Design an enzyme around this catalytic site. Structure first.
Site, short mmCIF file in Angstrom:
data_model
loop_
_atom_site.label_atom_id
_atom_site.label_comp_id
_atom_site.label_asym_id
_atom_site.label_seq_id
_atom_site.Cartn_x
_atom_site.Cartn_y
_atom_site.Cartn_z
N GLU A 98 0.81 -1.22 0.00
CA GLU A 98 0.00 0.00 0.00
C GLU A 98 0.85 1.28 0.00
OE1 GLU A 98 -2.90 -0.38 3.16
OE2 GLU A 98 -3.45 -2.36 2.38
N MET A 113 -9.87 -2.95 -1.99
CA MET A 113 -10.14 -2.61 -0.62
C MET A 113 -11.15 -1.46 -0.59
SD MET A 113 -6.38 -3.14 1.03
CE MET A 113 -5.55 -2.20 -0.22
N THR A 114 -12.36 -1.78 -1.01
CA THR A 114 -13.43 -0.79 -1.05
C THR A 114 -14.07 -0.60 0.32
OG1 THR A 114 -14.68 -2.59 -2.08
CG2 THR A 114 -14.00 -0.77 -3.51
N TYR A 115 -13.28 0.00 1.21
CA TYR A 115 -13.63 0.36 2.57
C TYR A 115 -12.57 1.38 3.06
CZ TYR A 115 -10.68 -3.89 2.99
OH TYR A 115 -9.68 -4.84 2.80
C1 LIG Z 1 1.82 -5.69 12.55
C2 LIG Z 1 0.89 -4.64 13.17
O1 LIG Z 1 0.95 -3.46 12.84
N1 LIG Z 1 0.05 -5.12 14.07
C3 LIG Z 1 -0.92 -4.28 14.79
C4 LIG Z 1 -2.25 -4.25 14.00
O2 LIG Z 1 -2.08 -3.51 12.75
C5 LIG Z 1 -3.09 -3.90 11.78
C6 LIG Z 1 -4.46 -3.20 12.04
O3 LIG Z 1 -4.28 -1.78 12.02
C7 LIG Z 1 -5.48 -3.57 10.96
N2 LIG Z 1 -6.68 -2.71 11.07
C8 LIG Z 1 -7.90 -3.22 11.24
C9 LIG Z 1 -9.10 -2.27 11.26
O4 LIG Z 1 -8.07 -4.44 11.33
C10 LIG Z 1 -4.89 -3.31 9.56
O5 LIG Z 1 -5.83 -3.79 8.62
C11 LIG Z 1 -5.60 -3.23 7.31
C12 LIG Z 1 -4.59 -3.98 6.44
O6 LIG Z 1 -3.26 -3.59 6.76
C13 LIG Z 1 -4.91 -3.57 5.00
N3 LIG Z 1 -4.78 -4.71 4.11
C14 LIG Z 1 -5.98 -5.15 3.75
N4 LIG Z 1 -6.15 -6.22 2.95
C15 LIG Z 1 -7.50 -6.62 2.54
C16 LIG Z 1 -4.98 -6.97 2.43
O7 LIG Z 1 -7.03 -4.45 4.27
C17 LIG Z 1 -6.45 -3.30 4.98
C18 LIG Z 1 -6.84 -3.41 6.47
C19 LIG Z 1 -8.00 -2.49 6.90
O8 LIG Z 1 -7.55 -1.13 6.89
O9 LIG Z 1 -3.62 -3.97 9.38
C20 LIG Z 1 -2.62 -3.56 10.35
C21 LIG Z 1 -1.31 -4.28 10.01
O10 LIG Z 1 -0.91 -3.88 8.69
O11 LIG Z 1 -3.30 -3.62 14.78
C22 LIG Z 1 -3.57 -4.34 16.02
C23 LIG Z 1 -4.76 -3.69 16.73
O12 LIG Z 1 -5.92 -3.78 15.90
C24 LIG Z 1 -2.33 -4.26 16.91
O13 LIG Z 1 -2.57 -4.98 18.13
C25 LIG Z 1 -1.11 -4.87 16.19
O14 LIG Z 1 -1.26 -6.29 16.10
#
Ligand SMILES: CC(=O)N[C@H]1[C@H](O[C@H]2[C@@H](O)[C@@H](NC(C)=O)[C@H](O[C@H]3[C@H](O)[C@H]4N=C(N(C)C)O[C@H]4[C@@H]3CO)O[C@@H]2CO)O[C@H](CO)[C@@H](O)[C@H]1O
Ligand SMILES: CC(=O)N[C@H]1[C@H](O[C@H]2[C@@H](O)[C@@H](NC(C)=O)[C@H](O[C@H]3[C@H](O)[C@H]4N=C(N(C)C)O[C@H]4[C@@H]3CO)O[C@@H]2CO)O[C@H](CO)[C@@H](O)[C@H]1O
Lengths: 497, 496
Positions: B142, B210-212
């Site tokens: 991203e 990622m339509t959100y």
């Molecule tokens: C490794 C790390 O940073 N771990 C964090 C964790 O980070 C997560 C969350 O922020 C996710 N957010 C949510 C709302 O679940 C986040 O989701 C992202 C993802 O990166 C993107 N990729 C996709 N795909 C479909 C491939 O969709 C988006 C989503 C939605 O925005 O991902 C990051 C890691 O990249 O956050 C948790 C707490 O929630 C923290 O404890 C820790 O484990």
């Protein structure tokens, strides 16, 4: 530097074949009308028109009596005895021979196609020039488009190489052979080759802008055919330059090309000056020595910006000659156009025409309330504003179509020469008015701007301005983590000093 | 053709290292939650996330206890025993690892730079795939910048080459190894690689949109994070795509990219369909299994389109957990996000939240009048319209982030599977509504039209229609004397 005064001289084949200087019903404007004094008022006389034949070489219309042709040209070159700066050029093309549906169009397209055709055509241009005694070549193809431009440019570069060698060979360093072209003066036709203007202009001594015919019966609303500046009350147009293959962004196109816009002389000039690599000194502003007439105009605004009932077809379809007092129109069978000479006579003939003036466009017009006629033309007064514009914009000079339409005393030419050279004429206080100026800004004419340098790793908000790699950039939306120029988020708005 | 149901499954490193299926307080959603019935509802489970290390190869986070990792992954591949069409993919990237200012960003930029780095990276993707037992590769960078796009494309083409070789080598003609990417679902990030969409999609089985996250604290006005269609009452946005390096004319750009426009799911899908060579069957619509929360909202429209006082910083800048009832927010230290599982529990704890519905966007939202709170999210109802949209637009299927946020009963996954596959579910009468549709027209979606063949030597007035070289054109102004494609006065407006 002396401003160029380029006067095209149009003499049809029928007139060349029956050339006489004692019968205006046969030759309305013979070369004898140009005295040593008038010869001194011109820097160039462009004999019109030669053509390109099926053999893809420059040539006279086949119907031309060669001996009468040489004779008319000799009368013009003889004028050089009275002006050591004067050049007698010949122009190739014109609307009738070279328009898309013109009789010789295919010859223009085919002549510029290959290295071999270009060399053979270029060589024929130099041969014709030297055979008849001309001093340069003017190309008036109306107009090459998209796919033909590269050939056209290469053809001009080849003609330039041959003429420069000819100059050396003939030891003509004091008065080098020249190459010029007449260019579109409105955005619609200009859009055809606009993207490559710098390359087209590079091999030329001047590009003569046909900044007239911006109005005519082929348009639904009456308007000035050569307004200097725009009038808010007049019609506006779609800016066709936005469709040129420039490879610019939506923001860049929109900023460079205001739309709708006023089709004016100032618009064409600014559009050419916008492009990097197009020197003002090479730009020559054309002016018309003729007017265009409309019938059926409503009253109230002197006939300006009105609907009308003027046929737009060529040739004129009717036998009805409705332009009161225009006997030239009856002879030429077209009430929609008249030489300044004839228009001046009509103003003298007490026919009910009111000579009016638009203080925004800086141009005169005739209104005949009684018959509902409207005539857009130029005169010695509108020429004052165009001459000052030329000096102010540092243009190369003025060009006009055509010598043969001036009145008998040659007052229009005299006026032009006077505005640029008379010690007793002073336009220092001439008011250019509040007419609309064309102000498009593109990647080629960016202003100097000042902004804090870009900082990698920083996130920028929308509208933020930073300088980076020689330019000032502006973000079109928020949270920019990209560097200027590395993505569509930044717009180039200025140059770093 | 069955619609793909792609469930991303995110399990952070600390949970892998402390994996347990018996303690919800350690691993909230262990693999055992994925019962055989749930496994049959998925076509793919995308294990998230792997990364790209300093050696410029695909790799698990360094802090990962490998044995625990193989154990978690094996439970996932074991699920294939229940569903012979199920694929367990792994995803490389994610916002934390790959965003422009992310910790591994440089590794993504460098891995795709040269033929050698691209071969080394591609080879590492396949090695990790075969080593841990995955069925395909998903890249979630991203996002690559415009300058990095050509390297990105070659990288994808190279992985494709090696995966097809491995498929023949492993006799997997029945279930070929796959390559997909998670792509931007909004025009701002999409504009980075939009001009080369066709080349980016060619080597993929699917592009998972990622339509959100189309709304969030980072925006000044609260809004639905995944509206299907637009609501005239909501905010509108600058259409960044009109600034993409497309080499199109002002007319072409303006007709393809209205601005401002409504940032919706439909807009992203249509924007992709506008490009030639991006088949609908490869487009997968992403839906979120989580909600985004805002505080300090004003009343009047249920918290919608209001100014708010939600911090936009990451990590959450505070220990003030204001999302009433969200115990999970305290655990993860962010009251701006909550899983559907938690939102549901907030709703049944009767904390004063009101579930409202916007019939334009076809999405639900919560409104807490007392504390001035707004929550945008998706549920089984909003999924009916999005599933119907997927069927109507002939898209490849649906994708969601992420499985671990569904409720214990797996209601969100069950609903998606129902809408596509249940024999007793009938949405033929489902009304899609009057929400704003994205009206852009481009190369990839020219409408069928008929018109008199262009006649060489004919002059055409303004607005004239003609057929030439297979398309229908229209003049932009009058007195046109040359051919379509040979005169810019013509606008290609339709086809065959
Ligand atoms: C490794 C790390 O940073 N771990 C964090 C964790 O980070 C997560 C969350 O922020 C996710 N957010 C949510 C709302 O679940 C986040 O989701 C992202 C993802 O990166 C993107 N990729 C996709 N795909 C479909 C491939 O969709 C988006 C989503 C939605 O925005 O991902 C990051 C890691 O990249 O956050 C948790 C707490 O929630 C923290 O404890 C820790 O484990
Ligand atoms: C040989 C021929 O076609 N003879 C026609 C003659 O055609 C003329 C006129 O239509 C000219 N119009 C006017 C108002 O003088 C027309 O002038 C054009 C010229 O082609 C373009 N080139 C320039 N340059 C500056 C290079 O300016 C424009 C001007 C002004 O628009 O030229 C054509 C020939 O190409 O017309 C007369 C009278 O109708 C007819 O009897 C016949 O002799």
């Amino acid at each position: 530097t002396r401003k160029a005064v380029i006067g095209y001289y149009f003499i049809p084949t029928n007139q060349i074949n029956n050339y006489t200087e004692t019968d205006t019903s046969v030759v309305p404007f013979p070369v004898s009308n140009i005295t040593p004094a008038k010869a001194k008022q011109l820097t160039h006389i462009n004999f019109s028109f030669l053509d390109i034949n099926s053999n893809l070489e420059c040539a006279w219309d086949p119907a031309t009596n060669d001996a009468k042709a040489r004779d008319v040209v000799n009368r013009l070159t003889a004028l050089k005895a009275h002006n050591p700066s004067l050049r007698i050029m010949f122009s190739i093309g014109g609307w009738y021979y070279s328009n898309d549906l013109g009789v010789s169009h295919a010859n223009y397209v085919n002549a510029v196609k290959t290295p071999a055709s270009r060399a053979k055509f270029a060589q024929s241009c130099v041969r014709i020039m030297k055979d008849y005694g001309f001093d340069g070549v003017d190309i008036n193809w109306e107009y090459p488009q998209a796919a033909e431009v590269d050939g056209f440019i290469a053809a001009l570069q080849e003609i330039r190489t041959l003429l420069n060698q000819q100059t050396i060979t003939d030891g003509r360093q004091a008065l080098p052979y020249q190459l010029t072209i007449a260019g579109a003066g409105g955005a619609f036709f200009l859009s055809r080759y606009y993207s490559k203007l710098a390359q087209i202009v590079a091999p030329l001594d001047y590009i003569n802008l046909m900044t007239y015919d911006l109005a005519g019966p082929w348009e639904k609303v009456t308007n000035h055919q050569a307004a200097l500046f725009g009038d808010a009350a007049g019609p506006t147009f779609y800016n066709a330059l936005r469709e040129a293959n420039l490879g610019w962004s939506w923001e860049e196109l929109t900023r460079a090309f205001p739309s709708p816009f006023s089709l004016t002389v100032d618009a064409a000039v600014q559009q050419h000056l916008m492009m990097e690599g197009v020197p003002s000194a090479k730009i020559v502003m054309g002016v018309p020595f003729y007017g265009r007439a409309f019938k059926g105009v409503s009253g109230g605004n002197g006939g300006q910006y009105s609907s009308h009932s003027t046929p737009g077809e060529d040739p004129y379809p009717s036998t009805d000659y409705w332009l009161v007092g225009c006997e030239e129109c009856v002879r030429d069978k077209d009430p929609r156009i008249a030489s300044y000479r004839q228009l001046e006579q009509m103003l003298q003939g007490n026919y009910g025409y009111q000579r009016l003036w638009n203080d925004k466009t800086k141009t005169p017009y005739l209104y005949h309330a009684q018959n509902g006629l409207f005539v857009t033309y130029d005169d010695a007064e509108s020429f004052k504003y165009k001459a000052k514009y030329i000096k102010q914009q540092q243009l190369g000079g003025v060009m006009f179509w055509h010598l043969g339409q001036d009145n008998r005393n040659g007052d229009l030419l005299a006026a032009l020469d006077r505005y640029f050279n008379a010690a007793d004429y002073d336009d220092s206080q001439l008011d250019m008015g509040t007419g609309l100026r064309y102000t498009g800004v593109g990647p080629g004419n960016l202003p100097i701007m000042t902004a804090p340098a870009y900082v990698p790793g920083t996130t920028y908000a929308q509208g933020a301005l930073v300088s980076y790699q020689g330019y000032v950039w502006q973000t079109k939306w928020g949270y920019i983590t990209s560097a200027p120029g590395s993505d569509s988020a930044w717009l180039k708005v200025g140059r770093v000093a």
